[PDB]
Amino acid sequence: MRECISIHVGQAGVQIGNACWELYCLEHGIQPDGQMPDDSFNTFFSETGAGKHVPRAVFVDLEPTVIDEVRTGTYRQLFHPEQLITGKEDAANNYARGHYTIGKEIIDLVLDRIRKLADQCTGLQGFLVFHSFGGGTGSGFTSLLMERLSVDYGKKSKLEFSIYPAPQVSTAVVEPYNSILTTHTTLEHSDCAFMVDNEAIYDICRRNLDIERPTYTNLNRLISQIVSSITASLRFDGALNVDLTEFQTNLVPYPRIHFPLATYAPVISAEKAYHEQLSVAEITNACFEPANQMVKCDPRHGKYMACCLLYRGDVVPKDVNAAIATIKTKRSIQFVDWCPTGFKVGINYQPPTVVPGGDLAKVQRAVCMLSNTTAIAEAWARLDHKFDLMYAKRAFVHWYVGEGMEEGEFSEAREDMAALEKDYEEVGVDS
Amino acid sequence: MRECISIHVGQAGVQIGNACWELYCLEHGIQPDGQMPSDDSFNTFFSETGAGKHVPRAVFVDLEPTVIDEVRTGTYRQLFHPEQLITGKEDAANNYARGHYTIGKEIIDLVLDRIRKLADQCTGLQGFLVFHSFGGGTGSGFTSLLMERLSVDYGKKSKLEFSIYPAPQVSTAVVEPYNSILTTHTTLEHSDCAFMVDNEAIYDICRRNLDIERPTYTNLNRLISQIVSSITASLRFDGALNVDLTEFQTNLVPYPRIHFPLATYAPVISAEKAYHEQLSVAEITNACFEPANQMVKCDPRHGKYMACCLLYRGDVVPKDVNAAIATIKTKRSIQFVDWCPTGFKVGINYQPPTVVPGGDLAKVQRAVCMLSNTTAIAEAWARLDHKFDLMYAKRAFVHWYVGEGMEEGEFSEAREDMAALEKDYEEVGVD
Amino acid sequence: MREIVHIQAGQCGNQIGAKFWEVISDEHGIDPTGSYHGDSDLQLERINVYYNEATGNKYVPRAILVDLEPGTMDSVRSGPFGQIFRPDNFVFGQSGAGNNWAKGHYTEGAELVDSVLDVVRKESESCDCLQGFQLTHSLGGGTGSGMGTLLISKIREEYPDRIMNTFSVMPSPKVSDTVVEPYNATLSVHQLVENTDETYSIDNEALYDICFRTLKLTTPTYGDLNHLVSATMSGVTTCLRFPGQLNADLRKLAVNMVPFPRLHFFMPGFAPLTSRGSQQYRALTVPELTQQMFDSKNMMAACDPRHGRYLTVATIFRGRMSMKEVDEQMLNIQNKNSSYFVEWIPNNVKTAVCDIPPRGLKMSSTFIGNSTAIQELFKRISEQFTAMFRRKAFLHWYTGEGMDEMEFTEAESNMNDLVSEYQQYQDATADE
Amino acid sequence: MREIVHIQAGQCGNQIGAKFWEVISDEHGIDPTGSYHGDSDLQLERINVYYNEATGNKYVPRAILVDLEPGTMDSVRSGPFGQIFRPDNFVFGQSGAGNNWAKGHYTEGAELVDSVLDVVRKESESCDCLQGFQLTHSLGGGTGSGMGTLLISKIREEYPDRIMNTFSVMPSPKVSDTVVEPYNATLSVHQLVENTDETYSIDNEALYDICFRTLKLTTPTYGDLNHLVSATMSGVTTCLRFPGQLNADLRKLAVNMVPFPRLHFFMPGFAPLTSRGSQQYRALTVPELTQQMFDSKNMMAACDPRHGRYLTVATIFRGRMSMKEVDEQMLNIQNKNSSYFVEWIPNNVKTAVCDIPPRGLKMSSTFIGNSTAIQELFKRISEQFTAMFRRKAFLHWYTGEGMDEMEFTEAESNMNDLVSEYQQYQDATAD
Amino acid sequence: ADMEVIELNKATSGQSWEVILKPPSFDGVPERRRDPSLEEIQKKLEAAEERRKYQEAELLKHLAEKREHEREVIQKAIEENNNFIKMAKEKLAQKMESNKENREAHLAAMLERLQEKDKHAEEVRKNKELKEEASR
Ligand SMILES: Nc1nc2c(ncn2[C@@H]2O[C@H](COP(=O)(O)OP(=O)(O)OP(=O)(O)O)[C@@H](O)[C@H]2O)c(=O)[nH]1
Ligand SMILES: Nc1nc2c(ncn2[C@@H]2O[C@H](COP(=O)(O)OP(=O)(O)OP(=O)(O)O)[C@@H](O)[C@H]2O)c(=O)[nH]1
Ligand SMILES: Nc1nc2c(ncn2[C@@H]2O[C@H](COP(=O)(O)OP(=O)(O)OP(=O)(O)O)[C@@H](O)[C@H]2O)c(=O)[nH]1
Ligand SMILES: Nc1nc2c(ncn2[C@@H]2O[C@H](COP(=O)(O)OP(=O)(O)O)[C@@H](O)[C@H]2O)c(=O)[nH]1
Ligand SMILES: [Mg+2]
Ligand SMILES: [Mg+2]
Ligand SMILES: [Mg+2]
């Protein structure tokens, strides 16, 4: 019934997956061994004859280290060994090694495992793909997998949770190249992609959680919370639900313009105790303020095309409509003229669950806004500019060419990004 | 022996029939079970069974069962045999075309078969009395279908009508003028004499003379039955005027098309009123020349008489009648056409006026019904023709008739025949 | 003309339909188990129009509950009168329509349609004298809209001589639940113009405005809107379910209300207007009930009746009142407001009085108007459609389902012809 | 990416290589017998990168010791950690190369090469996931230089997809009087430009200057110079040897460090600078490490980094310190010294922090720079080469071994093109 | 003052007579179609039934055209999805084969470069051998 298959690619994808699946288990009362003492969680967990609940997920990495931690860790009994797939050598921060050289060795094995997971689905909605833009596996292997999924599953819905690079935590100088190549190759294969800018998350952790030097553990717990909000509508039966298809219909006005901005509220430190409880109006207002955004950009300088509000906890429809109506009277929040009605609402009963010993405080109500704003084009411009700086000198290009890639692929990828920036510009113009 | 078969079509025809047959039973001393503790003339309207029971020479027809279901479950269920109460399942939905062409075709043979069985029991069949509304789809559509077939099966056998002319105070369909004109055109060459009953005239008499604030069909029908009884009294009792159906035609119809006599009845007195002195012959005769006592709204001052019949009932003496007629002629014009003599055919039927016990009418010692063929009745056709014209010019509601297989040309044909009828009334009054 | 077969499709259709069944069950004295516990023979006289009599003393709604999503069906079963429905009459899919008319009409809907028709055929073949069908749905979503109109067309094909009636809820940005409502509504209106005999235009714009402006509810909910819908649905169906002379069945109502085949979109009116919480109220006389006919504030469609002309009107008065006073007050309103009634349809206003008032009120009035002002509702939808269509916004979700742009152009063109047709009769004169 | 295969060729190669093995064995807690006696799991996590695990608790360096002269082998076996090496991995000739690159590359070296490849193939085929090779040698002599580069080409032919890394010691007239060193260095640089992926330029000119000027050692010995080499070698391999995110393997390091294939010559830097076996009891601070590590006085190549621009930089901090302080200090240095970093390679400085400090220090910093200033080292060699070549001095030493003058002209031309290429990127602008 | 009374009939429960007030000013009494036929009636009722049946058939012909269009849209979506699969499959096979070709070409070029170095080395060895032994 209404299943969703999750695929976690490379270090970022796998580590975010660890945080997501840990949180889902806490939310549904599933123990680390798959045992549990609603019914909707079945969209994400299959059940065995022994009453054990197994994630509908595949974890893939070209190197074994990160997944080796999953198969030796707390949740080793949660996943069956066949759904944790590892090669021997990674893509060395090279898209070409991920997509071709190293990736072509494990691709058939990964598709064989997803095929076995899809065979256990009676109402497959599609795929949720988690990966970074920057790594050789997250960039190259993801694009290879995305193309192969379009072949085997045609138009079946494919949504991404993509980690947008930040220099504070970056491991490769070539991340802008890997980001542009994966974006060009995946564009026609993805229906909707939720970018998460590592700098935005890094700044929220520093500013809101008082973490001097945020680690991936800090970043991923916060990321896990946003993912869980986007997926709670599928994993629970609440006051107002929103499925995979409804997300595309309500957030994607044109096939290429498929990158919603996520904004989460409230993010409160595990100290204080006075900094709550925030009202529905207060948390909704916080969604339109730039500090709570998952991607760094300025919406005041852009136009909204679609807005989806996903509430969780002690939230009533009357409270929500009151908050959306005040947002409607706000001159500083502008919507495109070709959009008479821009709001889509999800409401779930369960307050946001926090990982014991985590940085986040327990809140009575939270919200995740997904908005398609032309302001997100600023994130593409910053990436495109870093690409241009290096590409003008062909700096590092030889590493990709050595793996059989052609310079023409770089030009093609960059021209497609230029057309994407041009599309965001055209979409924001009035008729 | 000279038998008359009564045919009650649709709700109005059936409900008026209930009131008429209830009154006939009271007049002849027939109980609701058909028993009578027995001047032989009542046999023209009632046949006799082997069990000594008296059965109306009547057929009740409806395209829906509700109204007749009341007759077969009511006080007079033993008066009628089941075979003379004929119903379909679905009505004509106030659509002449539906009553005539669609549904009517399903029950016509069955009705004629029942009529034929009643005619087989007659030794001197005079003809048919047909009771129906102009406004309903059955009353309009089924009646004209039946009248045409009766002319085929009983060539040159008398057919008289008691037709309910529509009034907006009690109307149930906006399309009543269409149905009225369609039925009038189709029935014209098949009817020998028709007594129209304008629901507004009856409604006004009930309000004014009977002090009924909001008259119901029960109030209207009791009053209608009194006039029907006045007209049929000399067929059902050994009278001297209108002794046979052929005599109505001879006495009132000088040209085949101008066959719509005007009925004027008096006195109509409230039962729930203070003891009063009985009205004399002069007073009731004077009431015959008052437009307020008419069964159709029209102005006899705007027309010319071509025949006048005075039907007295009860304690009436010829000397008092002649003196009353002599005084009227001195004060009033009472203008006849060039070719007709200025006069009256008078009939006294000694049988007392009868009222339903617990009804709205007071029992009176003497009453009178004047039947006059005046050109003023053309005013009733003009009012109907004008409402037809208003809607027809826009083809409003026409699609409902066309949808049943009627042609638009039938509306034009029916209206042209009404225009020729208005022209006939004008041409007849000229000199 | 006895039985009506009721169909409830999608979230809105099921929510409004469930409210209709609880309001009418209370009026007919039926409890949530199906047992009659009333104290009036009038309540049972025409019970068979909406209810089947099952084994023993029980009455079962002749209702089919449809959705592409299971959740709504659960919510109905869990509702106050949830257990009254036939369990086999709940027909639901497992994957919703994603607020996409094309998924409801061509893909997911088409896959569920035969399971629905089998249930409607079972109910229809059991009928002694089937009047036709009554569908409750929204036009803004995917299921009620796309699948609802697919059902209408499939039903028209199998029962071409039966009356097709709808309670169609029109979308509004004021209380919206999807960005593509203008597309879904226009594609549905195109279907309704061609395939229904009579449609009650229930406008969320008008319901929101009544709650906010008249009822002084700062933040109206679907609960507040649905309280006006259920009062309207009870009022407009009074003549079908209680004994009476006027518009006693679906065909006689259509013959009196529909002068031109495409002009079958009714503007409902209701008085007195009340809020769920307003359990006061002590008021309303016959002249007061009548005045609300021309009152735009009492219209369930966001159109001003004084901006057009009435082709035909059905007025239903409920409670203990003088039929004389009603006749006088109704004649006065027509004579005084002559200019808002077409002169070429004489006696175009028909009045009915039912002794049984609805619950909570001692006196009420329901208006059913076929007004040329309904063109304002269609123009509002057309302008919102055009603002999106001009830029081909969200169009890939429809063409992705196999649809062509031409269907959008055709639906828009047909709706604009409907507007042009209303305007033609608005300007027509009895120059005759 | 696990195993690295280490090769030590000639006197300098073996002396610096032996020092590397004693320094890294102490860091990983390995004694001269091969037994682990440390007290930290971090020491063994990546032990397999440089050591094979032999029968029992013993760890054996994956090291091959090569010389055309036997004496050095004896000196290595007699050294502190001499017994740790695999006896079969010592491959020694009897003749020597007499400071002649041609003898090492074409003659005597070619006669010993197959015996070396026997041993390298055995070590390589035993690898689960071979990263590649690390060669230590001088460029000024005959074996390390000529035979070392011959080994590079032979190994590359059999392992073309593995990383080739060198620690190449550049000659200086300050430490060696051998007149032919510029020829041997130029002939070797020509080989390195074409056949290695990454080369650490360890300059005897800079080592001598540090010992004389900073350490105040009037007459430095190879022991004094080698102490700076071993501190550098420990520092630059820290990321390969301990768990971490940055430059964790030879390929990821090359991808981050090498923007153009030929420009793979690194300028290493270290802080604090110390003399042999000397205390201590005053650890440098983070701002001090950050400043000192980017100073001309701390560079292991005799080039002023302020005379060029950094293409890419890897900075490694070792010891217990604040990662926040390191991030601030590192950002400050690149914002303040903006002009010494190319603007067309964004975020070209990558920082790593390892908790384990080297022995004798509580805090240390190692810098790996790809700087355009390294052209000063190549120009110094080229000027010394030309002064000799212009007069064809000592040419018969090389032509006597079968070489032609053209190889000298080609090597010189290739090295001058490398200088011209560094200058081109030094002058390039982002614009 | 003038009135002519003509007695008409006398019966058990009635009496009738004619009262003449004035004779007709115009003397000479006043100043049609058949029948109809059952066949004529049947022909008209049958013609109306054929019109009703013809229009119901036209409504059905149009509803069947809608069913045909419904199948055509379902088919169009199947075809577009199938062509999408076919397009992605060929683009991917071309990209993987082109990349294979280029990578093997780069590996061949570098091994050939190293092989030429070996040829040069044996030629160097030859020269040393011409110099050594064959002198002194
Ligand atoms: N938010 C977040 N980002 C991560 C995490 N791990 C790595 N990244 C980011 O993702 C990028 C590095 O890509 P990775 O996912 O580590 O590399 P990979 O997909 O494994 O690809 P290869 O190692 O080159 O085969 C840099 O931007 C990192 O900052 C993580 O756990 N959380
Ligand atoms: N006087 C009188 N008029 C009636 C009565 N019933 C209906 N009418 C009038 O007749 C017209 C309606 O026609 P009906 O006789 O009810 O309809 P029907 O003949 O049964 O035809 P359908 O129902 O359309 O099949 C309106 O003018 C009514 O006012 C009645 O009992 N008495
Ligand atoms: N830093 C350092 N340099 C050295 C050492 N030993 C020799 N050198 C330098 O290395 C170069 C001399 O080359 P060698 O390593 O002795 O030559 P080789 O590889 O043994 O080759 P041949 O003796 O000619 O067969 C000169 O630049 C010396 O300064 C040492 O231990 N440390
Ligand atoms: N009046 C009213 N409108 C509703 C209700 N629920 C949803 N709607 C409206 O219906 C449209 C959304 O369609 P909906 O029926 O929920 O989608 P569906 O389940 O695909 O048919 C929008 O115009 C919503 O405002 C309700 O309970 N009452
Ligand atoms: Mg990785
Ligand atoms: Mg009827
Ligand atoms: Mg030596």
Strand pairing of B54-56 and B46-48?
A: antiparallel
Residue C148 Cα: closest atom of ligand 4: 21
Q: Is B306 exposed, middle or buried (0-12, 13-18, 19+ CB in 10 A)?
A: buried
In contact, D317 and D326? CB cutoff 8 Å: yes
Rg (CA), chain C: 21
Does E4 reside within a domain? no
Task: Assess whether the C-beta atom of C204 lies below 6 angstroms from ligand 4.
Answer: yes
Distance CA(A375)–CA(A259), nearest Å, equals 11
- Total residues belonging to chain C: 432
Q: How far is A9 from chain C (nearest CA, A)?
A: 28
In contact, D394 and E123? CB cutoff 8 Å: no
Distance CA(D300)–CA(D296), nearest Å, equals 9
Does E102 reside within a domain? yes
What number of helices (H) and strands (E) belong to chain A? Answer: 15, 12
In contact, C356 and C243? CB cutoff 8 Å: no
Element spanning B344, H or E:
strand B342-349
Distance CA(C299)–CA(C292), nearest Å, equals 9
User: Which of A27, A69, A199, A246 is labelled catalytic?
Assistant: A246
**Closest residue of chain D to E117, computed from CA coordinates:** D153
Element spanning A264, H or E:
strand A261-265
Ordered alpha helix ranges (H), A82-172:
95-96, 107-119, 136, 142-153
| Single-letter amino acid, residue D165 | N
C261 CA distance to ligand 2 middle (Å): 25
Q: E124, E125, E133: best mutation site toward chain D, by most D Cβ within 10 Å?
A: E124
In contact, B55 and B82? CB cutoff 8 Å: no
Nearest CA to ligand 3 atom 27: D171
> CA angle D133-D139-D142, nearest 5°?
100
- Residue C92: helix, strand or coil by DSSP? strand
Closest CA to A140 of A194, A178, A98, A103: A98
Q: Is D216 exposed, middle or buried (0-12, 13-18, 19+ CB in 10 A)?
A: exposed
Cα dihedral D234, D236, D240, D245, rounded to 10, equals 130
Query: According to the entry, how was the structure determined?
Result: X-ray
Q: Is B247 a catalytic residue?
A: yes
Please name the chains neighbouring C, where neighbouring means 3+ C-beta pairs under 8 angstroms.
Answer: A, B, E
* Subunit contact E73:C400, Cβ cutoff 8 A: no
The three state secondary structure string of chain E is: CCCEEEEEEEECCEEEEEEEEECCCCCCCCCCCCCCCHHHHHHHHHHHHHHHHHHHHHHHHHHHHHHHHHHHHHHHHHHHHHHHHHHHHHHHHHHHHHHHHHHHHHHHHHHHHHHHHHHHHHHHHHHHHHHCCCCC
In contact, D286 and D326? CB cutoff 8 Å: yes
Task: Assess whether the C-beta atom of A176 lies below 6 angstroms from ligand 1.
Answer: no
Please name the chains neighbouring A, where neighbouring means 3+ C-beta pairs under 8 angstroms.
Answer: C, D, E
**Closest residue of chain A to E91, computed from CA coordinates:** A147
Pair of tokens at residue C329: 């007050």
Distance CA(D325)–CA(B175), nearest Å, equals 93
Q: A130 forms bridges with which residues in the sheet?
A: A8, A161
Q: How far is B398 from chain C (nearest CA, A)?
A: 8
- Total residues belonging to chain E: 136
Pair of tokens at residue A44: 């994400």
| Single-letter amino acid, residue B386 | H
Inter-chain Cβ pairs, chain D and chain E, closer than 8 A: 40
In contact, D168 and D301? CB cutoff 8 Å: no
- Residue C24: helix, strand or coil by DSSP? helix
Strand locations in C28-149 (E): 51-53, 59-61, 63-67, 90-92, 130-138
In contact, C14 and C8? CB cutoff 8 Å: yes
Resolution (A): 2.1
Pair of tokens at residue B57: 């020479």
Task: Check CB contact of D160 with chain E, cutoff 8 Å.
Answer: yes
Does E2 reside within a domain? no
Ramachandran region, residue A93 (left: φ > 0; alpha: ψ -120 to 50; beta: rest): left
The three state secondary structure string of A396-407 is: CHHHHHCCCCCH
Does E101 reside within a domain? yes
- Binding residues of D, as ranges, are 11-12, 67, 69, 97-99, 138, 141-144, 175-177, 181, 204, 222, 226
User: Which of B70, B148, B247, B422 is labelled catalytic?
Assistant: B247
Name the residue among E107, E121, E129 with its Cβ closest to that of D160.
E107
In contact, A216 and A203? CB cutoff 8 Å: no
Closest CA to A416 of A394, A393, A383: A383
DSSP-derived letter for residue B337 is P
In contact, D368 and D314? CB cutoff 8 Å: yes
Measured from the Cβ of residue C170, the count of other Cβ atoms closer than 10 Å reads: 26
In contact, C401 and C107? CB cutoff 8 Å: yes
Q: How far is CA D328 from the centre of its chain?
A: 29
Q: A150, A401, A409: best mutation site toward chain E, by most E Cβ within 10 Å?
A: A150
Q: C106, C112, C153, C197: best mutation site toward chain E, by most E Cβ within 10 Å?
A: C106
Q: How far is CA A17 from the centre of its chain?
A: 10
Residue whose structure tokens are 């009977």: B210
Distance CA(D377)–CA(D369), nearest Å, equals 14
Closest CA to C265 of C189, C348, C366: C189
Least distant ligand from the CA of C72: 4
Nearest CA to ligand 1 atom 9: A12
B100 CA distance to ligand 6 middle (Å): 14
* Subunit contact D344:A395, Cβ cutoff 8 A: yes
Q: Which contacts qualify for C71-77: CB closer than 8 Å, 24 or more apart?
A: C71/A237, C71/A241, C72/C10, C72/C11, C72/C14, C72/C15, C73/C14, C75/C14, C75/C15, C76/C14, C76/C18
Please state, in angstroms and as integers, the Cα–Cα distance from residue C194 to each residue in C44, C153, C264, C428, following that order.
35, 9, 10, 24
Distance CA(C50)–CA(C44), nearest Å, equals 11
Closest CA to D110 of D120, D122, D97: D97
Does E3 reside within a domain? no
Q: A127 forms bridges with which residues in the sheet?
A: A5, A158
Peptide bond into B96 cis (omega under 30): no
Strand locations in C190-280 (E): 198-203, 265-271
- Residue C162: helix, strand or coil by DSSP? coil
Task: Check CB contact of E81 with chain A, cutoff 8 Å.
Answer: yes
Element spanning D110, H or E:
helix D108-125
Ordered alpha helix ranges (H), D143-197:
148-158, 181-195
Residue B250's contacts (CB-CB under 8 Å, 6 or more residues apart) are: none
Q: How far is A404 from chain E (nearest CA, A)?
A: 4
Name the residue among C71, C388, C394 with its Cβ closest to that of A237.
C71
Residue list, CB under 5 A from ion ligand 7 = D 11, 69
Let me know if chains A and E touch, i.e. at least 3 Cβ pairs under 8 angstroms. Answer: yes
Pair of tokens at residue B141: 């559509």
Distance CA(D302)–CA(D95), nearest Å, equals 33
* Subunit contact E70:C106, Cβ cutoff 8 A: yes
> CA angle C154-C155-C159, nearest 5°?
130
DSSP-derived letter for residue A243 is -
> What is the dihedral sign for C-alpha D240, D244, D249, D255?
negative
Which domains does chain D possess?
A: 1-259 (3.40.50.1440), 260-373 (3.30.1330.20), 374-431 (1.10.287.600)
Residue D252 Cα: closest atom of ligand 1: 24
Element spanning B385, H or E:
helix B378-392
Range of the domain at E85: 32-136
Q: Would you say A423 is a known binding-site residue?
A: no
Residue whose structure tokens are 């964004």: D346
| Single-letter amino acid, residue E49 | E
Q: How far is CA C150 from the centre of its chain?
A: 17
In contact, D105 and D68? CB cutoff 8 Å: no
| Single-letter amino acid, residue D113 | V
Nearest CA to ligand 3 atom 4: D12
Task: Check CB contact of C111 with chain E, cutoff 8 Å.
Answer: no
Using most ligand atoms within 8 A of CB, pick from B164, B174, B204, B219 the residue to mutate for ligand 2.
B164
Does E77 reside within a domain? yes
Q: How far is C392 from chain A (nearest CA, A)?
A: 8
Q: A48 forms bridges with which residues in the sheet?
A: none
Distance CA(D421)–CA(D372), nearest Å, equals 9
DSSP-derived letter for residue B278 is P
- Binding residues of D for GDP, as ranges, are 11-12, 99, 138, 141-144, 175-177, 181, 204, 222, 226
- The CATH number of the domain holding residue E90 is 6.10.280.30
Cα dihedral A222, A226, A231, A232, rounded to 10, equals 80
Which domains does chain B possess?
A: 1-261 (3.40.50.1440), 262-376 (3.30.1330.20), 377-431 (1.10.287.600)
Please state, in angstroms and as integers, the Cα–Cα distance from residue D147 to each residue in B430, D18, D136, following that order.
144, 19, 12
* Subunit contact A340:C218, Cβ cutoff 8 A: no
Distance CA(B79)–CA(B63), nearest Å, equals 22
Task: Assess whether the C-beta atom of B139 lies below 6 angstroms from ligand 2.
Answer: yes
φ/ψ of C244, rounded to 5, equals 180, 170
- Residues before each break in chain E (C–N > 2.5 Å)? 31
Q: Looking at the 3D structure of chain E, how many domains does it have?
A: 1
Name the residue among E85, E91, E101 with its Cβ closest to that of A154.
E85
Q: In what order do the strands lie in the sheet with C363-371?
A: C90-92, C63-67, C3-9, C130-138, C163-170, C198-203, C265-271, C363-371, C310-319, C349-354
In contact, D289 and D221? CB cutoff 8 Å: no
DSSP per-residue string spanning D358-386: PTT-SEEEEEEEEEGGGHHHHHHHHHHHH
DSSP-derived letter for residue C395 is T
Q: Would you say A332 is a known binding-site residue?
A: no
